[PDB]
A paper describes a structure:
Mpro substrate recognition has unique features and is specific for Gln residue at P1, hydrophobic residues at P2, and small side chains such as Ser and Ala at P1’. The absence of similar sites in human proteases together with the importance of the enzyme for the viral replication makes Mpro a primary target for antiviral discovery and development.
For nirmatrelvir complexes, we determined the crystals structures of the WT enzyme, as well as M49I, N142S, G143S, Q189K, A193T, and A193S mutants at 2.1, 1.9, 1.8, 1.6, 2.4, 2.5, and 1.9-Å resolution, respectively. For both crystal structures with mutations of residue 193, A193S and A193T, even though being the most distant mutations of the active site, the additional steric volume and polar features of the serine and threonine side chains caused a displacement in the ligand binding mode in comparison with the binding mode to the WT. The structure of A193T and A193S mutants showed that the increased steric volume and polar features of the side chains caused a displacement of the inhibitor related to the WT. More distant mutations affecting subsites P3-P4 small residues, such as A191T, A191V, A193T, and A193S (but not A193V) have shown significantly increased Ki values for nirmatrelvir when compared with P1 and P2 mutations. Mutants N142D, R188S, A191V, A193S, and A193T showed modest diminished inhibitory constants for nirmatrelvir, with 2- to 3-fold increase in Ki values relative to the WT. Mutants N142S, R188S, A191V, A193S, and A193T showed similar relative catalytic efficiencies to the WT.
Numbering used by the authors:
A (entry chain B): 1 to 47, 51 to 305
B (entry chain A): 1 to 302
Write the structure that this text describes.
């Protein structure tokens, strides 16, 4: 039994973390084959940066690349969107099987927080609908990566770039394309209003049922339209026919039809939790996907 | 910024996890140097589960009755010894991935990371605390047994928990790596139960100090309290009594925020008398007791 906020084992990714230094700026790089990936704002001096020019003007020896106590020699450099690629003289002997993926809002991943190329902590995250993440990042955390594991293949999906005024976090996929309407300048930027990831709440209520927690279940059923009208009143994501099909395995497993569980969720939105908890939370949790619930409640290895 | 339940990177422990088989029972082992440590109930059949005589079953085992497997490689068992409730298996090869490690027995309130493993392959990593009643609120299915709890201090791994059994209230019990149970439990399928759990008061106060540091002050008041008056009230809410020792430990957080420990205790007191009233601290509508004073300083300062 049990239900925990659970990260992927971070071992495969720890074998890839390095330290990148430019003048006085130090942050983290992802060392895969003979290339080190890191945010391009590493090159930046104190003084609206012109990255293209700052990059082309700069020699190879200006990039100090440190893998533990070993120096890596940079033998090339190129830009891809908002990520800098440093061509190194050594293929990473610890390189796992990996692909770069870009994730949709509501999709979850593990962040490996690092400082000075040194992995510090791992935590589970969700891509918010406003494309921010509620992470935990201090100074030097930039270049820290988000990832999933599928068997032995690490799918890297996130590189950390910045903290927003609301204490929430912004970054790019490993191809340097920002998630959300952001720019890597010190310019004034702000998270749009977040919404609750409805399908995830429903998956987590299924996790509640599976662990013997049933007080919120009722005998009513609703329709998508009625549910979706109530949802957008509480800043909940619309529920699609897609979502309903993806929760099917959980509906089948528990014997509770999705459109019933939507009625249960509706009552909770309108009525609150009545001084009760669900899986030990006073808040409806939306950072577990349907897959996450199936993975944890079936067990799955790598 | 941000405040996340945060586990240690699992790489150094992933390198040590093995699968141990005896008869039809397979669970997980911890492979350190030329010893595999695992729960001794791996040698129990179905019948044995109620009043196992461990000495009488192990005296009936040869080395070759224990299958130890590391990935594809089957390890060769060359000696078997019992220490309390862990079995120690001497093996041909010393684990080359052996990190700096020590074995540590922790006290209730102390936190660690759990690497949930099945068939010697890791499933996920989460962060736990030893509950006052010597149980943990884990996430463990069939065959999770021998999964370990650890902390990492620089590059030294300290092993503090090995997983043995699930109690009827869906909470978990285990031993230190010397095989002495945390709490009054025994590795038998006889009727046993956890004492009533209490809230880890020192940890909730730590979490409140973090809240101020991350800029949230909605909950403070202008009162102070005596240590005795605090405990007289706090026990009435099933809180762990606060000791002078605990007050000493909070000194640094008290210094950094400028809020006296007994002033913070007045705040906590009022929160219990009222509750949240729809408001939250650090994204929670409950009081968090699974961050220690050390955890908070590490994640918010440096
Ligand atoms: C190890 N592979 C399992 C794992 C359990 C069940 C799912 N999550 C877990 O932590 N553990 C066991 O097989 C141990 C083992 C005998 C019985 N047992 C139990 O987990 C049982 N609990 C108790 O012994 C009891 F009653 F005291 F709570 C069970 C009732 C099956 C849950 C031994 C030797 C303790
Ligand atoms: C909040 C701050 C003023 C620091 C700024 N944010 C904004 O620019 C905004 F406020 F305008 F949004 C910001 O983070 N950066 C400024 C500069 C890079 C980025 C940066 O160096 N990031 C930190 C790096 N190791 C990570 C931080 C530390 C604490 N928690 C984090 O995550 C770039 C946007 C090019």
């Amino acid at each position: 039994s049990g239900f925990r906020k659970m990260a992927f084992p971070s071992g495969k990714v720890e074998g890839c973390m390095v330290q990148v230094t430019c003048g006085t700026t130090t942050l983290n790089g992802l060392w895969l084959d003979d290339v080190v990936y890191c945010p391009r704002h590493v090159i930046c001096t104190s003084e609206n940066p012109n990255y293209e020019d700052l990059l082309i003007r700069k020699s190879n020896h200006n990039f100090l690349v440190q893998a533990g106590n070993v120096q890596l020699r940079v033998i090339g450099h190129s830009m891809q969107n908002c990520v800098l690629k440093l061509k190194v003289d050594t293929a990473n002997p610890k390189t796992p099987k990996y692909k770069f993926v870009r994730i949709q809002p509501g999709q979850t991943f593990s962040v490996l927080a690092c400082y000075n190329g040194s992995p510090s902590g791992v935590y589970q995250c969700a891509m918010r609908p406003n494309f921010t993440i509620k992470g935990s990042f201090l100074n030097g955390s930039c270049g820290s990566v988000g990832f999933n594991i599928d068997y032995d293949c690490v799918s890297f999906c996130y590189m950390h770039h910045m903290e927003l005024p609301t204490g929430v976090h912004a970054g790019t996929d490993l191809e340097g394309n920002f998630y959300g309407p952001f720019v890597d300048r010190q310019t004034a930027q702000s998270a749009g209003t977040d919404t609750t990831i409805t399908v995830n709440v429903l998956a987590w209520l299924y996790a509640a049922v599976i662990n013997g927690d049933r007080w919120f279940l009722n005998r009513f059923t609703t329709t998508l339209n009625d549910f979706n009208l109530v949802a957008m009143k509480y800043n909940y994501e619309p529920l699609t026919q897609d979502h309903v099909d993806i929760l099917g395995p959980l509906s089948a497993q528990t014997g509770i039809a999705v459109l019933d569980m939507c009625a249960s969720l509706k009552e909770l939105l309108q009525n609150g939790m009545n001084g009760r908890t669900i899986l030990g939370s006073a808040l409806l949790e939306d950072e577990f996907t349907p897959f996450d619930v199936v993975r944890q409640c079936s067990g799955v290895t790598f």
